[model samples]
Target chain A: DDDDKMLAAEAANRDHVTRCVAQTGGSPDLVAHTAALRLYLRVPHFLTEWTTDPDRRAAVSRALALDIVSMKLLDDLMDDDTGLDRVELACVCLRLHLRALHELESLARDPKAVTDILEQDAVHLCGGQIRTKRSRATNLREWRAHASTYGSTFLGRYGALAAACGGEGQPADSVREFAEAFAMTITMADDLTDYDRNGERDGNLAHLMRTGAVAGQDVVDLLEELRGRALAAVAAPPGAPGLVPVVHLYTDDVLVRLLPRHLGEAGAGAMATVKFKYKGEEKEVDISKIKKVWRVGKMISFTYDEGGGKTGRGAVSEKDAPKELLQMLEKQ
Target chain B: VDDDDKMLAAEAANRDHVTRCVAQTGGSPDLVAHTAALRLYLRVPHFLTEWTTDPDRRAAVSRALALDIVSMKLLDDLMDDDTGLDRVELACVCLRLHLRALHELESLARDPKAVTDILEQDAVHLCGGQIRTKRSRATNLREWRAHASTYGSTFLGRYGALAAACGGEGQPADSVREFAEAFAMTITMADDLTDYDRNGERDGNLAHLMRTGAVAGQDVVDLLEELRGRALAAVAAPPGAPGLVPVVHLYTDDVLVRLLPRHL
Candidate 1:
């Protein structure tokens, strides 16, 4: 029931991303596009309470969507620059933000209140992204500090919502704490569960644990603590202000991304339709043609033998595998 | 007071990248001359020089405005009839300047992506106008209006929108966009009237129908004044860019005469 809105937002997001890139001439990263949309979806909901004007509401929704996505694309490029496509798409999204901003103004409400705050934050976001790119987090406190910048994104959305009512000079401190706390929960949950990947990186809390900078229980406790803090901060919010739902969205995304191994019992599991990433595009893992399966830790590695030995292998952690997918993997 | 000084200021601004393009790799007579020729035809958003008093912002906007004009003009040149190693060589230099202009635009914008998006669309609109001239050389009033308005308005709107991105938005940016489009429309007819004879002698400039006995002198005068009025209204009763109004005033004064068809 809750995922219905997410699916619709995601569908429109994909369509808009494709059209904008085509209209502007670029082949952008699809993963980053989806990631960007997911990261900011909370915003439209946050702003929903501020205005009943569909004209204003829809414009901010669309505008904020690209504003984040465009910046996300740039952040991706900064982390590892490649492809002229990212640059072109970033431009496309940036232009989309301006156009959407204009539409709101057409309704005679000024986003100067919004733009002034967000525009200033644009540079900070750029600089913040640059800091991440140029350096790495070594300790828990340092890593926590690194993750802290995400609050600005929340405040920016708050500022935008306030602008819908013609007054967004700055976000309130309550909104600020809520934003940072919510991001901390989402970010911490990833660090805890994604130790496999984040351990490879220098910044993740999991990485800190791997290096003995933090204890295993301590890290789990910290994650628990932050999740509690976020709830306390946003307890008064819209059902989403539980922000707990959005935190779950991030959780769902992380599991989809991180837990690679799933069932591979060929024909027996053919109808199961387990979701997994084959290469980069997401698809239902076709289990009917599996030739072999293997595992390392919770990871399940499997191979599909289609006509030729040009075999395809995939893996996932059993930690959160779908009920039947796990049972079938065990059977195999 | 002096149009020559205005031309010189625009030229100096235009020349920086010319040197960058030519010297960084190579230069030739055609490169130098075509760019110089490009200057007279492709106008910069001159209002920028006087719009802000902030040194760095002004410098970036001024440099960016010049680079875009020169670079966009070269883009058109590359598309048109040019040949030999000269064109290939010129094409390289032109493309370099084009990117440099883009980067400059990127710097001027508070948000880098905004420039890329606007610039990409502007290029399409501007080039669409250019190749349309190549394909359908307007022979009538309707065609003439489209052709006349296309190139000037596209580029001018680009410059205006970009300038607005630097620090202006909402009313000010809207003002710039409208001002550029309306003003560009005025320039089209004004140039057509002034250069009517040269166009015929040189290439039977499109919309020779206007030059025909079919279109009356009074009709032509009325159109130019009408376009002028629209532009004046866009820049508005006060000013669009604080410095641009007078330039608009000065340029419109000469568009009807020896200034005729000076550059297309």
Candidate 2:
């Protein structure tokens, strides 16, 4: 029966996307973007596990699709610095979220109850975004908490929706815990791979390394602990079994590969020499040699030591730096 | 006084409230902070300025209203950021202040339950609007108008009821609600017109309406004129209190019309 429900939900999910994209006048590019993101999230099957009512399940699924699209648009806006009108774009995204909120409200018993949950979700979601944008350096504990908040904000609405659909019999807290763990694990895994590739990092692992919250090996150990917690939480009886496939997809497909890769890289010695251009001249230098790295617009400049007790400085266009060199500079 | 004088005074008062709140929180006033701060001042029905003679009572009501406005504004702003968890916490804090103020107002009112009911309803509709307005897809004009009216009525109704309670005339609840609803609809439409430019390209009320192939500028203007007449007649109708007529005229002539461009 559950398998049948899951398959049915999958069909509804596909139909919902097609209908919504067309209704919203979504471009070909946006349609593809939503499709790819939906493939990764697979929320409809999860909804099916939460609700037996087909209409309720379908409505929730449609809301989730719109919510994801709004999130994707917001992410694109944040990542882009193309001199576009951010305020205008932000307004559009906000309106999209409002629409998503309406669909979610349609499933709730009391609209106010749904709003209350959304209000909390918004607080956590906005808090994390602001911290990331501000680039406030933090310790590992703080970063992990921030990561948790980020996860909770995005998924909390769906957790609430699931509880609403399942009525009084649902294990709401357990469902919420599962969503939180799933989100946190996925975010942590994403951060690890993203950091490995681009040298841009956030969350516990990054903060731990930056502040020496734990020793290098201990950081890896902590990550393993998180991964274990995630797996355990989802594998428990109260967990949404439909989500297990996605969990394994993250684990065997993503985290298993990512953890070892991160360990090998972070395990590298703390102090190392990196090559950089100094005053239009090339030189090799140790981590200790670099005093400061600052960016002003597109130019990233470094203040560093030179022989004979002299100071040297260099600037490089952010675009010109190779990914490897940029990673090195980012570490410093 | 000159127009500039009134404008300058309003700006000063606005900055004062914003500065005090930001100082209390020790947080930077970003877009969310600024919008919330401004709304706290703007939504206080101007009639309240004249209705309450007791300075202390007036101040308390103002604080309560401002707290509620800021709470709603912060909740609305939460969607603007990708991670809004912190904003929600801040909104909750403001909401606590609002509830506390509501408690105080309830104690002051003859019908405490009446006051509480309106305030609670305001919160619900405000949140409803916040959720509904987020749609990126084209929604029906009628639906949008209904949503807008719901938000406006609750906000204005609370003020009208409060004014009646303070007026000591025991005004009929239905009449006050009707008057407030009329005034609110006009104000809401004017607000839509003002925000037209910024919201025109997106899922804005006017833009969505235009896209739906149902309405245009003149249609909105005609609607506003009708609402204005209703607001005026409601104030002038039998069983009207002393301050109600002047309050209606002041809002319609000064606050509501001034929001729209002269051409409209």
Candidate 3:
């Protein structure tokens, strides 16, 4: 019976996505993309355990569909460089989100709570914007923090709505934690995939590697750790079987496939050392020994252990690094 | 330096508070420029000169008052024809921040849950105003009045609560309600009057009320006069509160008379 119920809910979710994409005037390509991504995200199946009433279930499904479409369109609009009026496009995206917000309010116990949730979402979104404009991370600690903020922005909105749909009996905190964990895993996987890409490279895994914050092997290991955390969070009590699929999807199906394809086994396992001339002496430091690496314009700063039980800091021009190191940094 | 000196200090403090608020969350240079013009036009600097010695209370009251003005300016920008999406989003962000801060302040003075309910209602009504403005076309007087009343009550209800909070512990809700409604009516009537002949558009509140023919033109004037009187009566004396009466007068009589129709 549970399996049958899950299948039925999944079908309803797919139907809701089709209707929403049509109603919002999404292009055919966008509709296909939305449908495919909706399958990957699997939010409707996730809602099955929390809601039994068909109407409420449909309402939650519709809200998630609209939210997903809005986010996708906004990403596309931001990435466009064809001299379009992005302002108008952004307004259109905002209208769709406002509509989604309205739908969410209809199911909320306190509409004001919905506003509070959305407001937090806005803060996280805007925080990302502000961060991208101002800084480049030189360390894994800072990169992880930015990644968490970015992830929470996405999770806060969707997770809050999920909790609201569960009504009084559900564990809101655990649901939010599950959402956060999933979001972080996805973010890290995205970073791993995009490690060699150029542009928008300020806070991703490649940038972290280029800054020498973490070696290439460390990134591979971090991804595995985050995946485990996500799986553990989803598998905790009162969780749905639907979410378990996500663990496999993100870990084995996605990350496992992307990692070796992008990095190659040799590059993925390689540890790049940092070399520089310091105080008339040549110094070579292991990437793992470095605690921080950040760049501002062309100047790079590194903080690392100099051995002899001492910590040291150094600065150098981007051009001064080895040919291989320079190639890695410029890849972003 | 008794009451008069106290009022002067309060007004200065209010101006300083507004200036600081604008600078902190101003975002863009253009937004700051628009805010400065709005401040000058509204004479906000001269209005709230009343004094309080306690810095914390002074800051709280001044912030509540400043937020109300900033919210109005943001809403006005949203309604204007020239506002682009960038400006719209910026205004929205600013509004959200201020409303949140205002909510936090109000929660300290009253029940937090009640404050949330009130703010939610405020948001719904504000959203309704935006929707109405977007969809509005030539409409009948009764429908127009209903729309106007909904918009009017939102601001009145929200600011009434804020005013009550500023009125200090156990402030009389009756006084705040009376003042807020009267003030809202006067402002609404005044707005309608100013819009009566702008660009040959005669679809303002005064014109609509007149079109209904349910009430005489003189009767409408009498009603405005009555509201003004009631507003002033609600704050006849400051009751040891800094800047309350002056704020009421600034919103009601001063603002209303300045914007009244030329013939009136």
Q: Could you give the interface RMSD of each candidate, to one decimal?
A: 12.1, 9.5, 7.0
- Model 2 lDDT tens row, A298-321: 877777788868987776687864
lDDT for model 2: 0.54
Q: How much does candidate 2 score in TM-score?
A: 0.53
Off by over 4 Å in 3: A1-125, A131-147, A153-176, A184-225, A235-242, A250-332, B1-26, B29-92, B95-99, B121-126, B137-146, B162-169, B188-223, B230-258, B261-264
Error of 3 at A263 (Å): 10
Write the residue-wise lDDT of candidate 3 on B1-264 in tens digits.
664474456555554554455445424555555554444323331222122334566456555655555655554454343544344344444544454454444444444344444454445345445345344542544465456555564556555665455535545555665666666666666666655665344544555446555435565556666766776776554443335555555655554456443434
Model 2 regions lying over 4 Å from their true place: A1-11, A14-36, A39-41, A52-55, A68-106, A109-112, A119-129, A135-139, A193-223, A235-239, A259-332, B1-41, B44-227, B234-244, B255-264
Tell me which of candidates 1 and 3 scores higher on lDDT.
Answer: 3
Fraction of native Cα contacts kept in each candidate?
Answer: 0.00, 0.00, 0.01
Candidate 1's error at B243, in angstroms?
Answer: 10
Candidate 3, residues A1-332, lDDT tens digits: the string is 65565566666666665555445444455456556654433554554345546677667766766665555555545345423334333433434454565566677776456656655455455445445434666677777777776565566567767678645655666667666766766777677666654354666665566555667666666667766775666666666556676566776654456555445435556566777778888887766566666677887777877776789877778776544444544453
DockQ (Cα-based) for each candidate: 0.03, 0.05, 0.05
TM-score for each predicted model, relative to the true structure? 0.46, 0.53, 0.54
Task: Give the fraction of native contacts in model 3.
Answer: 0.01
Write out the backbone clash pairs for model 3: A138-A293, B6-B51, B7-B49, B7-B50, B10-B49, B10-B50, B10-B51, B11-B48, B11-B49, B11-B50
The digit string of per-residue lDDT tens for model 1 on A221-330 reads 45556556545645553222534666555544533443222112221222553455778866455455555665578876676654575776566666644565555566
- Which residue ranges in model 1 land beyond 4 Å of their true spot? A27-43, A46-58, A80-87, A103-111, A120-123, A150-176, A189-200, A237-244, A247-332, B1-156, B161-264
lDDT of 1: 0.52
